[PDB]
Amino acid sequence: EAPDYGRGVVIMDDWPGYDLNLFTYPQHYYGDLEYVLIPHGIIVDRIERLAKDIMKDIGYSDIMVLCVLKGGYKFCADLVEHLKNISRNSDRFVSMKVDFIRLKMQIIGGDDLSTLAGKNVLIVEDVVGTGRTMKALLSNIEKYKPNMIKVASLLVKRTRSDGFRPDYAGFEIPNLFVVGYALDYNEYFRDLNHICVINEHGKEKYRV
Amino acid sequence: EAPDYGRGVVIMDDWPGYDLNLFTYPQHYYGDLEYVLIPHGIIVDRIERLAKDIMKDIGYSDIMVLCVLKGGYKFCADLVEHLKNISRNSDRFVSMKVDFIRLKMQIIGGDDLSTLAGKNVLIVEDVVGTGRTMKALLSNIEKYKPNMIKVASLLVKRTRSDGFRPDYAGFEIPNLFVVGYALDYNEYFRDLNHICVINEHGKEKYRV
Amino acid sequence: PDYGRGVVIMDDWPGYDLNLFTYPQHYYGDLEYVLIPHGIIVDRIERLAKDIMKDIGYSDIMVLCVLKGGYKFCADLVEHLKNISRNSDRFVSMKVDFIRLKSYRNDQSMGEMQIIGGDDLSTLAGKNVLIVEDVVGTGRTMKALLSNIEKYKPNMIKVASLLVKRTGFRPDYAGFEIPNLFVVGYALDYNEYFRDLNHICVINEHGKEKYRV
Amino acid sequence: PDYGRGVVIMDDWPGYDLNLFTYPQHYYGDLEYVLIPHGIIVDRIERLAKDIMKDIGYSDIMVLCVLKGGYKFCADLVEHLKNISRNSDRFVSMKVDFIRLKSYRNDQSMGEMQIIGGDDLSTLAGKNVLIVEDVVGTGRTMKALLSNIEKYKPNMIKVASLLVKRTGFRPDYAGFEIPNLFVVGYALDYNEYFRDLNHICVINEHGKEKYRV
């Protein structure tokens, strides 16, 4: 069968990744990372395609971007930049507003979400693991009666049968733990450019 | 006298700005903007210098970046990228953590700010007008006893004698109202790339 | 008003202070001020690309880069055209070529121009040609090049120049209209120096002497 | 292990599916798959620049771009070197030149190489030269170029090549070590097409026929 492109870029279980010594990375993490799972540049290239897909699907009306902090911030900043790039340099434009929330399910911060009523909402999230977080978030947002909700997740783990399938998925990754590109381990590694797998040394060094 | 470079790039009262027809911008704002005050690219060039200055001053230890949402998000994303660029491509590196707050003074969202105790905090803000907001914020953050607090503001208006002087200031602008580069008018114009002065048509079109 | 002139930089433009920006450390003390920051050049190129795509989209174009000074403007203009072509419903299919110009006088004092490098320019017959150049001064260089290319019977020739001096030749696409000053940076040189400078700048007397031939 | 080989792309590398990325619409249906996405090329160039700065920082270098295929790798490598030079305490002072190579056989079947364009290469005497090239195949081109430059007595010559094929010549700086396949994109061409393609790709049989000479 032809691929299901809705899965995003498929990173296989036997993917060895890229060797950190061949790329640049924050020097304070020297010795703390095992390998590069997804280089920064491939993330940006993939986001270019997602932005084009999103514009096709929901560019016909205003978009309310809802960033899921903190891990979503880089994917949201870059995705928004790509959408902006289209709205100014092509024939196709979309008015965007942006908001930011943190999840505890309690939603922390953000505007009064009654402002979402009748609007097209694009949730921007870092990674789907079990899918429980996204299912709960959708259930909470749906109560404000937006016109539609789309979920973009940079990463989706391959696991279970009760997963969550985002509308826009960057990469489908093995069921392992990832950091970088704003994703953290105990608040560290958000400043790392590439998505990486930490090594055992890093796991202990940054342990709480 | 030689210039006070702490003022940042000085945009004079008689600055005519740049004509929108010579640049790109979100097409949904066609007819809604008067002129470009500060092109996107000059903002990025200035941030490059600020990042270098910040690394000189406080790169010697970990930096806790505190983004003042929503208007600070683009300046914070770009400033962080420039700091990251230094931490990976030069000889000088700094570990950064990031957090996000909204101001109401109540601080909305963010981590437990007791985690700021004994740390070096870099507040990242969009624009200083009267300076009241930054003075109040500093007074609130100081109560958690960080080791030091630095304030980066992209813009500072030239006004009063009781102003606030940020540690890092991008541009000193005339005392007028600005949007773009995440700065809004009634939630609009955050997706505009350049910092602009809205025209009378835009003021009415987007009025609440 | 006349947008064909591009961004107008006025004679009393004081420019930007180097101390507020980053620049090559090896040129500290050689430059007087920034005439045009790197970032505004990129912003302006974005619009030139959009303008070019409006005029010649859905066609094949041969981009002809005038080395050496044109290389940075050409690389960036081409990237912006590529951007539109993959991210919008308009494209240009691009080929690229590179030429260097050497102007001289013959035995009766007639100006001649040798075109160095490049493909066999007979390959331009019936093609759409976009010349990409750094700066128009007197305009003599672009007038000579145009007549050289025109003899191969291209379908059309358009000229993009990053800078045009106020003193003439009018390019189809002009980034900035600048005072009549010698400028360097963004690949533009003084005696092969300063091409690695990011911002378009004016050099001081120390820089003029230090890098003199 | 041997990091001098660069990023190793294996023979059973399936590449990336074009349908998951953006690319020039005019090439839809001409390409089989993405061998190396644009973004990983940029990431790798970042590290090559850092490596080069470690080896030759605080010195003057002449960057020698091998046109046409080298232009994109050279523009981007140079931008990354410029980045370090203004944002760190190490710099290289750079000049740039451009050459095109034409290989032929003489009347006794000896391989010759004409160097087209460029400065008078006598100006390389005592200089540090960084050659920037797109791809090493058999290595014959780089061996010929090196011996041509060496006769002008430069202080040193280093070679950066974006791609090196497994089949030899070993550049000082190599981006990626690739299977022995014909590749295009990132300025690399097939019969002058595909230079405007963003990603390094392998073309299909339709593309091979359509753009044949």
Ligand SMILES: Nc1nc2c(ncn2[C@@H]2O[C@H](COP(=O)(O)O)[C@@H](O)[C@H]2O)c(=O)[nH]1
């Ligand atoms: N940084 C990081 N966050 C993760 C990872 N896996 C899941 N998360 C985050 O953990 C939370 C739980 O995910 P869930 O299992 O509900 O899909 C979500 O906020 C998700 O984004 C991971 O590997 N790294």
Ligand SMILES: Nc1nc2c(ncn2[C@@H]2O[C@H](COP(=O)(O)O)[C@@H](O)[C@H]2O)c(=O)[nH]1
């Ligand atoms: N978007 C936008 N925000 C502004 C402008 N001037 C001040 N602000 C914001 O208004 C608040 C009040 O500023 P203050 O007068 O206390 O310095 C701060 O959040 C400041 O960033 C402006 O011109 N545009």
Ligand SMILES: Nc1nc2c(ncn2[C@@H]2O[C@H](COP(=O)(O)O)[C@@H](O)[C@H]2O)c(=O)[nH]1
């Ligand atoms: N680097 C540099 N080149 C210039 C400047 N002015 C003119 N040129 C170059 O000098 C040559 C002669 O320009 P023309 O007078 O024929 O327009 C052209 O190649 C033009 O691009 C300048 O200020 N700086």
Ligand SMILES: Nc1nc2c(ncn2[C@@H]2O[C@H](COP(=O)(O)O)[C@@H](O)[C@H]2O)c(=O)[nH]1
């Ligand atoms: N566009 C393209 N050029 C190639 C490829 N392989 C080799 N070349 C170019 O072909 C010429 C001969 O390579 P050589 O065999 O001498 O290493 C060189 O200019 C080299 O850069 C390829 O796969 N694609």
Ligand SMILES: [Ca+2]
């Ligand atoms: Ca999350």
Ligand SMILES: [Ca+2]
């Ligand atoms: Ca987390």
Ligand SMILES: [Ca+2]
């Ligand atoms: Ca503010």
Ligand SMILES: [Ca+2]
């Ligand atoms: Ca506001």
Ligand SMILES: [Ca+2]
């Ligand atoms: Ca020229």
Ligand SMILES: [Ca+2]
């Ligand atoms: Ca010159």
Ligand SMILES: [Ca+2]
């Ligand atoms: Ca070659």
Ligand SMILES: [Ca+2]
């Ligand atoms: Ca070729």
